[PDB]
Symmetry: C3
Subunit: 474 residues, 3 copies
């Protein structure tokens, strides 16, 4: 049954994702909840926009919650009469319909992959969350005589699976580390800024890999016309028109994507700020650090493991960088604020009628917040300031660092250059919000003039591995 | 003075316990508070049952606490007229009287031991909490010519003290690790369940060691009739009647012991749930792990040290076992719950008259609890899932593990088999509550048919160390 | 320009302090805020004493904060009419005027030092917080031919800078470790007490080093009359009169210094008790541990580093010392208190009208505090009591320990002797409050009779390093 496939690339990617999804039911259940998140976001916002009145809620006998909710009939009439609301719902509906159809097709294709694990590999569906990818890899390669998926190539190789699954991610890796993508900016008042988000990466792969107008012929071979240097300018002009058109589509989609990014950050992170706002000060590896620190032919879990082992030294390293002025001001401000708040607390503690004076509680509240915030920049008085050993621990995991980091490991410039590989989480959120606005501008003015250079790139750094196809240079 | 003892076994146990009690006053003070805990439990429950009225408390001028308390005369009349309350108090009184008489006798016997530390060993009572058992051991054995406690045996030996103190605990160890005690069960809806509590261990030692009808003649020699195989069936029948009778006593005592176990768990753990309920999710070594992981000839502190060194790796190991479905549901539920709660919090934060709507606070409260509970099953996104090194650290301390744990260290079955050696604290509490109900059933139907096998056991695995007596096989 | 200095001692101290102050602006900004702290303390207390009325605050329409504040005119009239308040303000004004004049002079002298870093060393003012003292040390010593600050001595040496900056701190070190200063006391009800504060150290340096009547001629040479033993008694009598006079000045200043110490502890620590009172239970290295554990020729940062590396093992070591009686009482008290509080919480949880009974909340509140306090003396049940390895880790950093600590590392006496080198923070605060009262008594009765011994000391342990001057013996 596993002979007429013709799409071994997509097949191996699906074989890997089911292992990364911890079986079949979790993938199905995970996909359903993904679809449900969008629908819930849309429905709750729509319900909040139309049904609830907010008049009898602010009161302008105890009132129940169901009173503020309008009955179904009047809520439907206000939705279908907003005009400026139904036009967003229509677009948010067609994307989900496309997604749902794609999902149904993927289920019917992942069920076929399920049989291949069960039958060809003899690995039950209850042992997946306990089977490393290495175990799955040995049974696929050693039994390649039975299922005879690839008879065309003389044999199958471990390097082949890595190349087949990751034919386009290697291309993505080569573009960012050769500065062939517009991800460096100079800003007035900020200085150097690296703006690399998921929209640009999604757009790069859509411009270069996916679509009927991309550089790749079917799935695993870029069009032969891109292997001849006789029409570099003509191909560049054609690519420039393509790049220009994709940017126009992004500019058209700007308002919709902005609503989606805003809604996602709010529904996902606007509650952690209330309960534990220090979690958004905790740092995480940025998307550039995932493409700058990524080896060639390295799967998602092999890289995620390295970013996990180097997560605790990185928090310490970024936390040993203080500021003589910030530390001075924090020390002094905490003293002054706490010295006033202590008197206030004593007058409050003795007789509590002071709590009825107008601006006593707010002053105490803001000062408690002020003391706690200011006392958070004051380090532990007996810490071992060792910001030189911290880089050793980090480099032992992520494996990549600019050459001007080893000696001067403690300057304020090295921290500001490391903070771009290891960014705040709050900063991460903020540039996910700005991605749908800046991404089109980046593609039209910065990437379009490079449309020639890319054409040279794809022409000079693409080799042809026999039996595999057109792959990216290491 | 230390020549006419005739009970060197009990003497050495008392010598050890005073060191484990950190001197003499602490033992006296500890015993008094132990007696006082029972009396307080009984008295407070009795006072709550009879004196307080709960009528003028629920209000059916500010009211004081002493108003709800009835005067002594009317409270005494209601106690001595309850009938169904005085019959429990009588039993709770006679046990304490027995305990108090035993305590007074033990004090007069521990005072004699106090003189032996002070005079024979020349160790002051202010240096006990700072003297290891090794220091006490060297001065006892090296000065065995002066106090001449044991002249019968040619000399005294360190192995002898371990054997003399622990003649019955070794027997307890051999029964659990040879599955000679009924502590394995199959339950519909739960599967495998190991139910081993203090009542069974107390009952085992009462059936086998203590009492005038046990297997041991005086204190340190089982009756010679149990060394002849000519009457195995007859001895088994006699033992079966004994086992049957002990079970009947337990069945009779079931309601009383149940009240004691319920009261003890409530008074000891029902407040930690309110303040810090995560402490009852913290795991602890179960009573079977104390008998399965216990070496032979190992005192209480030597084992407690090993269970201490292996406590932190064990919490990590049991905490690295997740569930693809539980983690998926938690992630998704937290998002949905937090997404609703964030909107609620914003409407609450803007104008607080929303706080007067009926079901807004309860929804917020349950959802905050829901988010916090659900967000507690979501691991740290950058943790080093290394559940294989954790078993190495644990095995280096407790020294005992089933053979099918080394290879498959990460299956869901190994965790469910390790959770029986290292059980939850909440689970520990729950099976202490169920011990007085299930313990009689275990003894009558499961241990009684084994009454023959035990007779064989005690006949084949009991050696006679010269000068020491009848000991258990290692 | 760096030739006519004549005060190389003060110059090198200033060169070091600017590095310890992380540049020039931070020193200027730090000094200004230091001056501002005193002024704010005085002004706020004065404003609180005179302006606010506390009559319309305790209420004896919602009332604003500005109503309680008296207008400027009536507040000025009450200040300048208090009599017993203006006499304190005058003294608190003249000290600050002296301080401000000294500060202005130091700025004009540190600006000259700023040019020496910028020009002679070619080290910009933006690289100071990132330059170790070693980098500053190499450029000073290797370029000693250009600025020719010291041509008198043949060359400059690293030992010379250490000696020049720290000519008086070495003297302070030799007096405390030879028990030549009155810092040991026997108290009824407390026993041994080591009372060494900043006032005594400040007074010691004022009696011995600073002033026109001290032992040192100009700055770096004690008067030659103190190098001849022919007038030991006469010099001792003169020194005794000096010591007596300094003590009289301290006794006169007792009330003022007491107000300053009280105010400083309150404004600095009286708020941490409210928010996080466990931070004042955290220990810190006492002032005697800074003079007992200090090497010879060791700068402030080299010692602070050692006190930082040995801070975490020291907290563990002092936290592994329990008390059999304290642990027993805590266990039992927590059980009893929690057993009552659990019943109270259940009655409170079922129906909340119980919250209106008078003494229910206070009982719950005090018992919650009681449980939390008592449950703070109860250690973790599975901790590795290893108070012997902890001393190894500590001694590896502070380098100094009494000889009767190595063997008996766990007695209650070693802890009570280590607690004097590593004292509580709350204890530290308390003896800073008592320093202005006890310091004069210590100098008059204990140090005055020693006035002879000191004269012998300064005569026998002062060597003359050529080119450097009169230094202290190592």
């Amino acid at each position: 049954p596993w002979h007429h496939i013709e799409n071994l690339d997509l097949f191996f990617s699906r074989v890997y994702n089911l292992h990364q999804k911890n079986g079949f039911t979790c993938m199905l259940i995970g996909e359903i909840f993904e679809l449900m998140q969008f629908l819930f976001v849309v429905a709750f916002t729509t319900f909040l926009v139309s049904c609830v009145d907010y008049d009898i809620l602010f009161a302008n006998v105890k009132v129940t919650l169901p009173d503020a909710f309008l009955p179904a009939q009047v809520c439907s009439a206000r939705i279908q009469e907003n005009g400026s609301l139904i036009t967003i719902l229509v677009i948010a509906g067609v994307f989900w319909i496309h997604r749902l159809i794609k999902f149904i097709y993927n289920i019917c294709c992942y069920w076929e992959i399920h049989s291949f694990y069960l039958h060809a590999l003899r690995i039950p569906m209850s042992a997946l969350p306990y089977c490393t990818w290495q175990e799955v890899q040995a049974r696929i390669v050693q039994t390649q005589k039975e299922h005879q998926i690839c008879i065309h190539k003389r044999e199958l190789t471990e390097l082949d699976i890595y190349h087949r699954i990751l034919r386009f991610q290697n291309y993505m890796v080569a573009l960012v580390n050769k500065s062939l993508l517009p991800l460096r900016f100079r800003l007035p008042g900020l200085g150097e800024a690296v703006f690399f988000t998921r929209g640009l990466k999604y757009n790069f792969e859509l411009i270069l890999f996916w679509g009927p107008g991309s550089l790749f012929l079917n799935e695993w071979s870029l069009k032969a016309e891109y292997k001849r240097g006789g029409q570099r300018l003509e191909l560049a002009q054609r690519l420039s028109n393509r790049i220009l058109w994709i940017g126009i589509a992004n500019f058209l989609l700007c308002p919709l994507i902005l609503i989606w990014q805003i809604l996602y950050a709010f529904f996902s992170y606007a509650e952690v700020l209330k309960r534990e706002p220090g979690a958004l000060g905790a740092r995480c590896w940025s998307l550039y650090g995932r493409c700058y620190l990524r080896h060639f032919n390295e799967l998602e879990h092999e890289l995620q493991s390295r970013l996990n082992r180097g997560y605790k030294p990185a928090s310490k390293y970024m936390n040993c960088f203080l500021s003589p002025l910030l530390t001075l001001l924090a020390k002094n401000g905490a003293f002054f604020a706490g010295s006033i708040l202590a008197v206030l607390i004593a007058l409050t503690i003795y007789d509590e009628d002071v709590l009825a004076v107008e601006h006593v509680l707010t002053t105490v509240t803001l000062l408690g917040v002020t003391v706690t915030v200011c006392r958070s920049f004051i380090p532990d008085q007996h810490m071992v300031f060792c910001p030189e050993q911290l880089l050793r621990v980090i480099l032992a995991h992520i494996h990549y660092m600019p050459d001007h980091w080893q000696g001067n490991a403690h300057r304020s410039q090295t921290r500001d250059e490391f903070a771009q590989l290891f960014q705040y989480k709050a900063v991460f959120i903020l540039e996910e919000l700005l991605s749908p606005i800046v991404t089109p501008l980046i593609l039209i003015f910065c990437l379009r003039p490079r449309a020639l250079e890319i054409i040279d790139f794809f022409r000079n750094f693409t080799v042809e591995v026999v039996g595999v196809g057109d792959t990216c240079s290491f």
